[PDB]
Design a protein around this ligand. Structure first.
Ligand SMILES: *[C@@H]1O[C@H](CO)[C@@H](O)[C@H](O)[C@H]1NC(C)=O
Ligand SMILES: *[C@@H]1O[C@H](CO)[C@@H](O)[C@H](O)[C@H]1NC(C)=O
Ligand SMILES: *[C@@H]1O[C@H](CO)[C@@H](O)[C@H](O)[C@H]1NC(C)=O
Lengths: 397, 50, 24, 50, 49, 50
C-alpha cells in the first residue's frame, strides 16, 4: 500500500552534545594490554548532534527523509520498540535499486530491489483492543519492486509491538558504513535508565554482519510503527496518534584514534588525535599520561586561498590535418621533418577522430598533454611496414 | 650549505623538482619515479644526522 | 648599553633556508 | 625570464602579459609546541608558535 | 579475490591432518603459515575474532 | 622497541612477510619483491648499530 500522511504537527529541530560514543573494534584481530592507533572514519566527540522525537503532548511525527552521509551513527533510547527498520538508497522509486530493512511479525528481512517506495511510508500498526494485541494492519511502505537482487530473511523471533511509555530503559546503537560495495553493520545494546538524553561514560560497538551491495546510497529513512486504536478516529492516514519516541543521528568523518586494549581485548578508552593540543600531545607520545614538560607537534601552514593562470595571449591553432592526414609521406631512409610554432595544440580532437593503431608516449603521459606549454616542437614522419613499427621505440635495434 | 645543495641532485630521476614529474606524468609512472628521489633525499639526510 | 666588559666588547667583533624546513 | 636564489630555487618571475617582475614568498610556515603542567595536576595548557 | 583478510569458504583441494601438539612443526591454516610449537590457549576471544 | 617495530613496514613490497610472498609468488617473480625487503630492513640494523 501507499498513502500520504495527514494531521501531523511539525516543529523546529533540537540538538545535543555527542558525548563519547562512536567506537568499535575496527577488525577481527585480537590484541590486549596494549595501546594502538588506527586511521579511520569516526564520530568526533562533542560533535553537535541533531535530536529527533515524536510526542503527543499535537502529533509530532514528521520523520523526514535524511541525507545519507558517507557514514552515519544512529542510536535510540528505547521504549515500546517503535523502530522497526530502515531504508537506504538514492532515488527510492525503482529507477534505481535500493536497500530495505524490516523487522515485522512475519519475518526479519533485508532486501535490495527495484523498490517503488511510498512517498511517506509507514506501518499501520493497530491494536486489537478486544484481545489486547498490536499488529501492523497496513503495509504502507512500498507498492512494488520490479526485481530483487539480494534477499535475506530471519525469524520474527521477538516482534513485540506492545509496551508502556516512560523513561527510556534500553539503548540500541548502530553504525552504518557502505564501502567497496559492502554494507558493514556494527551494533551494541545497552540497558539504561536515563532522563531522555545521550548517556555518559563509554562503551564500544561490535561488528554484526557484512553484506555486499552494488548500489550507491545518498538518502535514508527510518522504518517505524505507528499507533492506531479506538482513541484515534479517522482514516488510515489521519486516525493515528503520536507516541513518545526519540532518536539521534551523528555523521562520521575522517579521524585518527588511539585505542586502549585491556588484558581482555576490550576498548576501555580512546583518544581523539585531533581534538585539542593536549590531546594531540597525548597522541604524539602514544601515552595517556604526560609529565610536566614541553613538547612539539605537527607544523603550522597556511593553505593556498586562490588559484591563477597566466598563459600568453596566443590565438593561433597548430597544424594537424596537414601532418596526420597528408597526401604523401617520405621514404623512411629520408624521413621528413616539420616545425610547429606559435600555436595551441589539442590531442583530444585527434583521439576522437583518427583511427590510430598505436599512440605510444615516452617521458610524458598523453592525458596530460593538453595541460602543458612547450618549446622546440618538431614532427618527424615516414612510412614503414606493420611489422616494422616495433622498431620505433627508444632503445630499439 | 651542502644539505641544501643536495636538493638539486636528481639521483637518476627524470627531474630535480618533483612538481615537474608530478605534473607531466600520471600516478602509475610517477610512483616509480618519485620513489627514487625519496631514497636519495633520505640518505643525504641520514648522513647529516650522523 | 650592554653591561659587557671592555675586553669582551673587543672580543665579540673578532668573530663573524627557512623555506626548506631548516630552522634554528 | 626567471630569477633564481642561492638556494637553487626560482625566487622571481616575469609576467607574460605585463612583463612585470614579481617576487614570490612561500605561504607562512610555523613551528608549534605545547606546554603542560603535568597530567596529574591540571589540564589547562598553553601553546607556543616558534 | 581478497587474501587472508578474513575466513571465507573458498578453499583448495588439500586434505587436513590431525592436530599434533607440543612439537616443533610446520603449520598452515587456510593459507597463513609458520613454524613453531602450538599449545593450549589461555586467551579468550570475542566470537568473531 | 623501534628496531623491532620496523619489521612491519612494507618498503613498497606487496606485503610485509616472506611467508606471504613465498606462498604466493614464483621464485623468478619473487626476487623483485624480496630484494626490496632486504634493502629496507638491512638499513635499520646499520642505523641502530651506529
Ligand atoms: C526487471 O529488470 C528488467 C531489466 O531489463 C526490466 O526490463 C524489468 O521491467 C524488471 N522487472 C520485471 C517486471 O521483471
Ligand atoms: C577481564 O576478565 C576477567 C575474567 O572475566 C575479569 O575478572 C576482569 O575483571 C576483566 N577485566 C576487565 C577490565 O574487563
Ligand atoms: C585530418 O585531421 C584533422 C585533425 O584531426 C581533421 O580536422 C581533418 O578533418 C582531417 N581530415 C581528413 C581528410 O580526415
Amino acid at each position: 500500500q501507499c498513502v500520504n500522511l495527514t494531521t501531523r504537527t511539525q516543529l523546529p529541530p533540537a540538538y545535543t552534545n555527542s558525548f563519547t560514543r562512536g567506537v568499535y573494534y575496527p577488525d577481527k584481530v585480537f590484541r590486549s594490554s596494549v595501546l594502538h592507533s588506527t586511521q579511520d572514519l569516526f564520530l568526533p566527540f562533542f560533535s553537535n548532534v541533531t535530536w529527533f522525537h515524536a510526542i503527543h503532548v499535537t502529533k509530532r511525527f514528521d520523520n523526514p527523509v535524511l541525507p545519507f552521509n558517507d557514514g552515519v551513527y544512529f542510536a535510540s533510547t528505547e521504549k515500546s520498540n517503535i523502530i522497526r527498520g530502515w531504508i537506504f538508497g538514492t532515488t527510492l522509486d525503482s529507477k534505481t535499486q535500493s536497500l530495505l530493512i524490516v523487522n515485522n511479525a512475519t519475518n526479519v528481512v533485508i532486501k535490495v530491489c527495484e523498490f517503488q517506495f511510498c512517498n511517506d511510508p509507514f506501518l499501520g500498526v493497530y491494536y486489537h483492543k478486544n484481545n489486547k494485541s498490536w499488529m501492523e494492519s497496513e503495509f504502507r511502505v512500498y507498492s512494488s519492486a520490479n526485481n530483487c537482487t539480494f534477499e535475506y530473511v530471519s525469524q520474527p523471533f521477538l516482534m513485540d509491538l506492545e509496551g508502556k511509555q516512560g523513561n527510556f530503559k534500553n539503548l540500541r546503537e548502530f553504525v552504518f558504513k557502505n564501502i567497496d560495495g559492502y554494507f558493514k553493520i556494527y551494533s551494541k545494546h545497552t540497558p539504561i535508565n536515563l532522563v531522555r538524553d545521550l548517556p555518559q561514560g563509554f562503551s564500544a560497538l561490535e561488528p554484526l554482519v557484512d553484506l555486499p551491495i552494488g548500489i550507491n546510497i545518498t538518502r535514508f529513512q527510518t522504518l517505524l510503527a505507528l499507533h492506531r486504536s479506538y482513541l484515534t478516529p479517522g482514516d488510515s492516514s489521519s486516525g493515528w496518534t503520536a507516541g513518545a519516541a526519540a532518536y539521534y543521528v551523528g555523521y562520521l568523518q575522517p579521524r585518527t584514534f588511539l585505542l586502549k586494549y585491556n588484558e581482555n581485548g576490550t576498548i576501555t578508552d580512546a583518544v581523539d588525535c585531533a581534538l585539542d593540543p593536549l590531546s594531540e600531545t597525548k597522541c604524539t607520545l602514544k601515552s595517556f599520561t604526560v609529565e610536566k614538560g614541553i613538547y612539539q607537534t605537527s607544523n603550522f601552514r597556511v593553505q593556498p586561498t586562490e588559484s591563477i593562470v597566466r598563459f600568453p595571449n596566443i590565438t593561433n591553432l597548430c597544424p594537424f590535418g596537414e601532418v596526420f592526414n597528408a597526401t604523401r609521406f617520405a621514404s623512411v631512409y629520408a624521413w621528413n621533418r616539420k616545425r610547429i610554432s606559435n600555436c595551441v595544440a589539442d590531442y583530444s580532437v585527434l583521439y576522437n577522430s583518427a583511427s590510430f593503431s598505436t599512440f605510444k608516449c615516452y617521458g610524458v603521459s598523453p592525458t596530460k598533454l593538453n595541460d602543458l606549454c612547450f618549446t622546440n616542437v618538431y614532427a618527424d614522419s615516414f612510412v614503414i611496414r606493420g611489422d616494422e613499427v616495433r622498431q620505433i621505440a627508444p632503445g630499439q635495434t | 650549505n651542502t644539505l641544501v645543495k643536495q636538493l638539486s641532485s636528481n639521483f637518476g630521476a627524470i627531474s630535480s623538482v618533483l612538481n615537474d614529474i608530478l605534473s607531466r606524468l600520471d600516478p602509475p609512472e610517477a610512483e616509480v619515479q618519485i620513489d627514487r628521489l625519496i631514497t636519495g633525499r633520505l640518505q643525504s639526510l641520514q648522513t647529516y644526522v650522523t | 648599553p650592554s653591561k659587557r666588559s671592555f675586553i669582551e666588547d673587543l672580543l665579540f667583533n673578532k668573530v663573524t633556508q627557512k623555506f626548506n624546513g631548516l630552522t634554528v | 625570464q626567471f630569477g633564481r636564489d642561492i638556494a637553487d630555487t626560482t625566487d622571481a618571475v616575469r609576467d607574460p602579459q605585463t612583463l612585470e617582475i614579481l617576487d614570490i614568498t612561500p605561504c607562512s610556515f610555523g613551528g608549534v609546541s605545547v606546554i603542560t603542567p603535568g597530567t596529574n595536576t591540571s589540564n589547562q595548557v598553553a601553546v607556543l608558535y616558534q | 579475490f581478497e587474501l587472508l583478510h578474513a575466513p571465507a569458504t573458498v578453499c583448495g583441494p588439500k586434505k587436513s591432518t590431525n592436530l599434533v601438539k607440543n612439537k616443533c612443526v610446520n603449520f598452515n591454516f587456510n593459507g597463513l603459515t609458520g613454524t613453531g610449537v602450538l599449545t593450549e590457549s589461555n586467551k579468550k576471544f570475542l566470537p568473531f575474532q
